[PDB]
Amino acid sequence: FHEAFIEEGTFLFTSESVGEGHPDKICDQISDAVLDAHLQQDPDAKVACETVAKTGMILLAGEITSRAAVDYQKVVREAVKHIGYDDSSKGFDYKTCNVLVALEQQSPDIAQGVHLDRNEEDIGAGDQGLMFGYATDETEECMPLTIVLAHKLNAKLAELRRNGTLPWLRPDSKTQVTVQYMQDRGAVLPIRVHTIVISVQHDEEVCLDEMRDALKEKVIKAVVPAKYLDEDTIYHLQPSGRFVIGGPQGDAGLTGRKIIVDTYGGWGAHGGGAFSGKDYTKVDRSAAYAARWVAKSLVKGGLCRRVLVQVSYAIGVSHPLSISIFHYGTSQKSERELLEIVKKNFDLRPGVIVRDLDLKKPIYQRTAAYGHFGRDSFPWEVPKKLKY
Amino acid sequence: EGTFLFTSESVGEGHPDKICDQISDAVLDAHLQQDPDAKVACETVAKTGMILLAGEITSRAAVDYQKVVREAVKHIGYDDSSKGFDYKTCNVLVALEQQSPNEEDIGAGDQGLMFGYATDETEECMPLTIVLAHKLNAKLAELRRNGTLPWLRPDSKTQVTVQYMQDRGAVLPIRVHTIVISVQHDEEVCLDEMRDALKEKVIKAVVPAKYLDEDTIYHLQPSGRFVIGGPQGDAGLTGRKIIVDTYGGWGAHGGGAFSGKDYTKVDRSAAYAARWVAKSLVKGGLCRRVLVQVSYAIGVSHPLSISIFHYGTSQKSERELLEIVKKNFDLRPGVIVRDLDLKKPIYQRTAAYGHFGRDSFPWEVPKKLKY
């Protein structure tokens, strides 16, 4: 009878992550390197920096109003060097690539409608839109195990690449983790890892069997708790075989094309806005961080085992248009009661979020790989003590 | 008691991200017209005076990219420097790397995850929030093109907050709580005239009167000035409206963009198939609302995982729904392409007003289920 109980009582869920050298993630990191360069000189910089990456090319396009003097050639090339593209053998070289800049001022129509001649507390949302925050008690970091493990596998590849223990590794990687879960009254309980995919760019020397052995022994077994790995776990390691061609040569990349990788790995919800290259007046970023803070506060405060928060704005309007709560049936309180607790404890005006989460600080390049949520030393990851 | 709000947004055809989606799918369709087996990964970037095409194409087609891009921008309505953008005079840069070149067993072209969603709250099996948001942008384009509101320009955004009730997981729309409309405009029209027209000629022509009341909140031209717009106002990129393209924040999203990708990209083909599955389950009476996840590995034909969430709206378990899906659908990428007839140049039609909930797409025709 056990097989029948397993089929009925369990389900699969899949999340992916990508490494720093994935071309879409290159763009996110460069966009946030540009944002941080501005904020280091001008904490009030208005930044909307999109990056495009293709064979031999980084293009910056968008809108910046800032008192900073930023050397875009230096910032871009230093970011590409850090990622590890330093030779034509790797498909891309920070020393010799083309960097094109098409950056203008912020629209004066936007500036006058959002922030000009306002106290910072009264600044309007920098756009309309919807944003979600999510938290789950299934991990200590209050994140889905699927996305946590997917990100940590890419971080482990970069670590062993950079310390030279796996020197055949190159910067471009993708990971994907399928977890088999059971539920406890709307809370999800991870049982085992069902399937792992790892695809990583490599040099010309190493054989397919040697790479597959190292990815299991030095990466997967160093990241995934042994209790989640068993004789039935499926490993797709270099599944499409050779991956010498990678980075921007392999595929065009853009800023904001990994927004599900950046958030909850498909769990929770997403309002569609990209984070990278945007200052705190862009609610796509600041209100998603605040909603994460709310969701994590509700779970660590013991009000929910899992929770989703929606918030929405209109351009030029400080107060949110709507706030909504979905507790997945994991609270003794109604969604109406939880929403009252939120409105009693939190103030999701962008001019207040920036103070509560210290969002003028140049920490954004750190967020642009391995996820914006579930990591140490970000203000939105410190739960607020709730009163009600 | 038991009520809640949910918000979705949409953007118009001249929103700079949507310009990019439409151009990327115009390029895809141009290739498929000549070479039905064309491989296309066409990313478009739009900023002041510039359309850039970047990506990878394997095609026998000979495509005039200048003509395809300029005709797409003309149709959207950017035909003069007074509007911030002109198809006649803009820079078109082409960075596309083109190469000369059993179907059921072909491997996925990439790893990834994809979701499909359906809800019985509308006939089109889509959330009311995203349906109304899209229809408000379509009405703007309509009244711009027929000259009844000649001060309108192509760049628009809408946002609709609906107040809902629930019936055992099924969602029941009560009323429109809040509407935002921001639309690019000429320098002659006054703010009072635009706000009056947006309420009377746009909103009241689109939203059923039963959903509007004296408490409905209107944010019309809330920035107060929107003369600068299109790519001049804000850089556009392909695949930066993926939630507008799908369910308006309802259901779920795997992160893959649709526009500029041929039918061999599972980011597109498996999302369309997952929609087809979810819609078939709802129209088949098995659920009131349902979410389907599928995932792939590069070089593997069979999905790595398939998952169902019925929101508590089925008398059947998620396990029984999953068995019905597996008995009725083959979500191998080569089989999806055959079953949904995806080699046809139909993609530019998808690139504004959403990929789902609309007439005459094969993924919107429910499959009759045998179980």
Ligand SMILES: C[S@@+](CC[C@H](N)C(=O)[O-])C[C@H]1O[C@@H](n2cnc3c(N)ncnc32)[C@H](O)[C@@H]1O
């Ligand atoms: C507000 S802009 C995003 C922020 C912008 N990149 C910046 O530099 O602050 C995003 C979208 O809003 C719309 N938009 C542009 N200018 C606007 C204005 N003056 N008022 C309202 N909406 C506007 C356009 O559809 C544009 O693509």
Ligand SMILES: O=c1nc(N2CC[C@@H](F)C2)c2ccc(Cl)cc2n1-c1ccccc1
């Ligand atoms: O939150 C979630 N919980 C699932 N659970 C299964 C029953 C209980 F165990 C919970 C679930 C399972 C399958 C899928 Cl395809 C989505 C799910 N989602 C979900 C829902 C909306 C959006 C994103 C993910």
Ligand SMILES: O=c1nc(N2CC[C@@H](F)C2)c2ccc(Cl)cc2n1-c1ccccc1
């Ligand atoms: O499907 C959904 N249903 C809601 N309902 C409220 C109780 C019942 F009426 C249903 C709901 C409400 C608020 C929010 Cl913030 C999300 C919700 N979601 C949802 C969940 C996951 C992802 C995307 C949206």
Ligand SMILES: [Cl-]
């Ligand atoms: Cl936007």
Ligand SMILES: [Mg+2]
């Ligand atoms: Mg933009």
